[PDB]
Amino acid sequence: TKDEVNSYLIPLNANRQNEQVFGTNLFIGDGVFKTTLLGEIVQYYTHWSGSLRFSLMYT
Amino acid sequence: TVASISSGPKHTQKVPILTANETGATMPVLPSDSIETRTTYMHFNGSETDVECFLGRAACVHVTEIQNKDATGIDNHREAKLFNDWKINLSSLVQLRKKLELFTYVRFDSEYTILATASQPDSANYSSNLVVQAMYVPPGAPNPKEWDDYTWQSASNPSVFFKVGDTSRFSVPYVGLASAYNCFYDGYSHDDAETQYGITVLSHMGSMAFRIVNEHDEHKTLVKIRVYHRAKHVEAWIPRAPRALPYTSIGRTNYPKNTEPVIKKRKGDIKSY
Amino acid sequence: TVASISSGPKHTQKVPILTANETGATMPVLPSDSIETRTTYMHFNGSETDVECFLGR
Amino acid sequence: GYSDRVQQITLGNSTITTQEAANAVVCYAEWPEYLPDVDASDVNKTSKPDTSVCRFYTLDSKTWTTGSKGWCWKLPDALKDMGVFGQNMFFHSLGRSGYTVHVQCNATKFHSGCLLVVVIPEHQLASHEGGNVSVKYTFTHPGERGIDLSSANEVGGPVKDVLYNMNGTLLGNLLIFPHQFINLRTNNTATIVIPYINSVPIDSMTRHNNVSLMVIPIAPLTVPTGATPSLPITVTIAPMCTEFSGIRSKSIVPQ
Amino acid sequence: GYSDRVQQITLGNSTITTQEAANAVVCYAEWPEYLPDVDASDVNKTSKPDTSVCRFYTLDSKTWTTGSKGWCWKLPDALKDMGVFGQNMFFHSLGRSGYTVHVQCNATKFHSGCLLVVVIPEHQLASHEGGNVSVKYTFTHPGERGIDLSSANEVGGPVKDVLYNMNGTLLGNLLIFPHQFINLRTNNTATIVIPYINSVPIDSMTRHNNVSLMVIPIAPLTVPTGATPSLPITVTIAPMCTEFSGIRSKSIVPQ
Amino acid sequence: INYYKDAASTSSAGQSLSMDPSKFTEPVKDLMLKGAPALN
Amino acid sequence: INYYKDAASTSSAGQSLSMDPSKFTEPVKDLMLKGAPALN
Amino acid sequence: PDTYTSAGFLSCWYQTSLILPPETTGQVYLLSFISACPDFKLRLMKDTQTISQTVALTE
Ligand SMILES: Cc1cc(CCCCCCCOc2ccc(C3=N[C@@H](C)CO3)cc2)on1
C-alpha cells in the first residue's frame, strides 16, 4: 500500500505442491514493469518489438 | 507505340471474339479483331493515372476550431475550445476516402499542410497576431488538460508553431505498425463477444492537439484549423469495387437505411436510347 | 543482420540460461538459447534512440 | 485430349475430379507459398502439419432455389472445426494458410441459372443498423454454416442486402475480385486457388478472417418443366501450405 | 566445468534445466529417429507436426510418502490429452514416437530415500484374479493419472504387487531394463531417452501402449526430524520424432 | 537536390511505368490463347 | 554546406552507430562465457 | 496498453516444491529482473506519462 523494499521480494512457501508463485500480464509500459529502467525508457517511445529477458535469482 | 495496327478482311477458323467469361478472365480483344483498322499511334503514356499521381495531391482531411479568450473561470478548457484536439484519422471527410478505399492496403508517407484563419464575430478592435501550436500526441503520452499544461512543453513530441493566416507544412514517414495501412479489416482486436469490429481498432495512431499560444486580448478570436493531407511514395495493393452508398461512420462500411436507388432508372424502355 | 538464428532441439551439458546475478553482469541470453527458433532479420538500426536524437529536438 | 474442362486436384489423402470445369483462377496470379525468412518477424519455428491439414474438407450442402439470394463463408472460420486443421487453429497463437476452393453445382442441359463465385480479401461487413453500430463477433463467425443472405436481419449481425455486397459497393463490380461463374449451360464447378493475403506476415486465425468466399445466384435458377425447382450447391475447401506458430493453451472464443 | 551433473534439454518451445543429474540413459544405446523407407509398409505420406508435438508435457505431481509402493504410467497413454500431441493421436489411424522422460524429486542433504525409474518395453500386466482373467482396457489406460501401486485391487484391473513388477517377475531384476536411480543423496532427477521399439514399423496409438514408465521407492523416504514426512515427485515427458499417418475421422475409445 | 535528411521528406515518387494488368485480367491457371477456343 | 564559420552552428550530429553495452552489461573482471558455469 | 497489440502473460508455479533444511523456517524470496534482448527495437519518440508539473520550479 505504500512503496516498500518488499514489493521487490516474491515470497516462496515451503512444502506447497502444484501451486502458483506469481502472475502478471506483459504490458511493459504499465503495471509492474512501469518503474523499471526498461519500462521507464519504453515510455519515451510509441512502438516496441523484440525479445525480453526475465530472470529470477533465488535467495 | 501503336494504338492500332492495320488489319484487313478475315475468313478464319480462328475466332478471337468468342470466349467463355465463366473462366474469370477478361480476354484482351482489340478493335482489329473484329473490324478492318489502319495504323495509329498512342501518343500517350498513362502518366496521370499512376497511383502516385492519383493519391498525390493535398486533400482537406479535417476542419476544427479553437478560440483565444479569457480562460478565467473556465472549468474545462477542452470544452471551451481553448484548445481542441483531433483523433487523427483519414476517413472523416469523404472525397479522399472514396479514393483510398479503391484499394485494400495502402502504404505512403504523408505531407500535412495546416491552414489557420481567424474570425472575429463580435464587432472588434486591434487583433494581435496569434500563433498556433500544433502538437503530435501519440498514444501513451500525456494528453493536454488545460491550454497551458506542462504537456505543451512538448520536449519529446514534435510540435510546429506558425501564425494564424499562414500555413505550416511538414511530412511524417509511414507510421503504420504493419507493412501497409489496412483500408479494411474483417477482424476484431481480440476474440471478445462485444468488442468493436472494423479498423477503428487498427487505427490508432493517436491524436493531434492545437492551441493558441497567445494570452487573451479584450475581444474573442475564433481560429478555424484546416488540415490537408498529401500521400507521397504511394504503394497500393488489391483493388476493390468503388463505394456506391453514402458513408455513415469513420471506420465502418455501414451505409444508411432507406438509402436511395444508386442506379439511375431509365426514362423509357430497355430499348430506349 | 539476423535478429534470430535458426536453432533446434538441445540436450547438453552446456546451459546458457543458468547464471549467477550476484556477479553484476547481465548475461546476453537470447530466445535461441531456450526455445527452437527460425531465422529472422532485424530490418532496423536503432537510429532514433541515438543520444543525439534523444536530446536533439 | 486434355481439355480445360476435365481436371483432377489431389491434395493430401483426398482427390476431386471435375469433368466440366472452366479453367481455374489463381488469385492475383500467385500460388500459395510458405513464409520466407526475409518476411518473418516472430522468432518461433513454425509447425507444418502438411498432409493432415492440407486435404479437402466438404462443408455441408446448400439448396439453390428460385428465391435464393446468395451465401457467404469466411476463411479460416468455415474450417474452424474440420479435423486437425481446426485443432491447430485453436491451439496456436498465430497461423497462416492459402486454400483451394472448389464450388460444385450440376444440373442438366434443360436447366438455366448462373452463380458468381468470388473471393474478397478483407471483406469488412456493414451493420444493417447504419450509423456506427458494430457487427458482433458471432455474426461474422458463422462457421461451416456460413451466412445466408436471404435470412432475416438479426441484432448485432451484418446487413444481407445482395445488390450491395454487404458493404456499400455494387454487386456488379465484384468482378474486380478473383472470381469464376458457374453457368449451368457451360460449367458445373468453379475452382479458385487463394494465396495468403495480409499486411502482416502471420496473424491470429480467430480474431481476423482474411477472405470471404461468396456464391451468389445472378441469373435465377430455371428448371425444366415439372422438374423439382431446386439444385444443391456444395462447397469443398482445402487449406494449402498451412503453418502454425506460437503453440500453447488453446483459445476460448465467444459463443 | 561441464559436469555430468548440470544439463539443459530444449525441445520445441520448452526447456528443462537440472543442476543435479546423474548422466542420462538412452535405451539400448539408440536415439529416437524417424521411420526409414526401407522399413515402411503403409504407403501413406506421414505427418510430422514437429515442434507442436515434440515439446515437454509435465504430468500432474505425485506424493512420495513413507507408505508409497510406486506408480506406473503407460506411453503413449499418459499423453493422450496433452495439447496437439493428443489430438493427432485420436485423429490418425497410426502414429509412432520416441520420448525424453525427465523424473524430478528434490529433498535436502538430511533426507534419504532412493527411487528406481525404469522403462519396460511391452509391459503386459497380470490380472490379480489369476487364471486367465483379462485386464480391461480402462485399467491399462489410466491416462495422466497413471496407476498407483498402493491403490486397492479393482475388478478387471491389474494386480499391484510391487515385488512382482505387475507380471510374475521380481522387482530386483528390473535393472535389466533401461533405468536410472534417484538417490536423494546423489541425484535429484532421472532422464531416459526412449527410441521407438515395436515389431511393426508403425502401430495404433490407442490399442497398444509400447512402454510403461515406472517410478518405485526402493529405499524408503526418511525425512529429517520433525520434517514433513513427504516429497512430491513430478514426471515431465516429451514426444520426440513423432509421426502420424492415416488421418480420418477420430477414434472413439472406451470410457 | 534533397535538402533534408530523411526519405519521407522527398517529393512525390515518379511514374511506376510498371503496368501489368494480367494479375487482374487473366488470373487463370491454364493459359488462354486469344483465337483458340475458350473451352476445349 | 556549412554557411557559418563556427562549429556550434552546424546541424545535429549523425548516428554514433557506436553501440557497445558491455561496459554496462558485463563489467566483470574475469570474463564470463555464456554456457560455461557462472561460478566454478 | 493496446489490446490488438497485447503480448501475453507470464506465470510461475511449483514444479515440485521448496524444501527447507532443518533448523530453518519461514518464507524465502526470489528477486526478479527485466532487461531487453539485443533483438529489441523502440521507435517514434514521444513524451512520458511518468513526469509532470504544475508551476515552473525555481532555485
Ligand atoms: C507537429 C506535428 C504533427 C504531427 C502529426 C504526425 C502525423 C501522424 C499521423 C500518421 C498518419 O495517420 C494515418 C491515419 C489513418 C490512416 C489510414 N486509415 C485507413 C482508412 C487508411 O489509412 C493512415 C494514416 O507531426 N508533427
Curated annotation (Swiss-Prot), chain B:
**Top-level taxonomic group:** Viruses
User: Quaternary structure per UniProt?
Assistant: Interacts with capsid protein VP0, and capsid protein VP3 to form heterotrimeric protomers. Five protomers subsequently associate to form pentamers which serve as building blocks for the capsid. Interacts with capsid protein VP2, capsid protein VP3 and capsid protein VP4 following cleavage of capsid protein VP0. Interacts with host ICAM1.
Annotated function: Forms an icosahedral capsid of pseudo T=3 symmetry with capsid proteins VP2 and VP3. The capsid is 300 Angstroms in diameter, composed of 60 copies of each capsid protein and enclosing the viral positive strand RNA genome. Capsid protein VP1 mainly forms the vertices of the capsid. Capsid protein VP1 interacts with host ICAM1 to provide virion attachment to target host cells. This attachment induces virion internalization. Tyrosine kinases are probably involved in the entry process. After binding to its receptor, the capsid undergoes conformational changes.
Q: Where in the cell is it found?
A: Virion; Host cytoplasm
Full-protein residues shown here are 584 to 856 of 2179
- What is the protein name given in its UniProt record? Capsid protein VP1
From Swiss-Prot, chains F, G:
Mod. after translation: Myristoylation is required during RNA encapsidation and formation of the mature virus particle.
Q: List the disulfide bonds.
A: none
**Location of this chain's protein in the cell:** Virion
Q: How does it assemble?
A: Interacts with capsid protein VP1 and capsid protein VP3.
Q: What does this protein do?
A: Lies on the inner surface of the capsid shell. After binding to the host receptor, the capsid undergoes conformational changes. Capsid protein VP4 is released, Capsid protein VP1 N-terminus is externalized, and together, they shape a pore in the host membrane through which the viral genome is translocated into the host cell cytoplasm.
Q: What is this protein called?
A: Capsid protein VP4
Q: What is the lineage of its organism?
A: Viruses, Riboviria, Orthornavirae, Pisuviricota, Pisoniviricetes
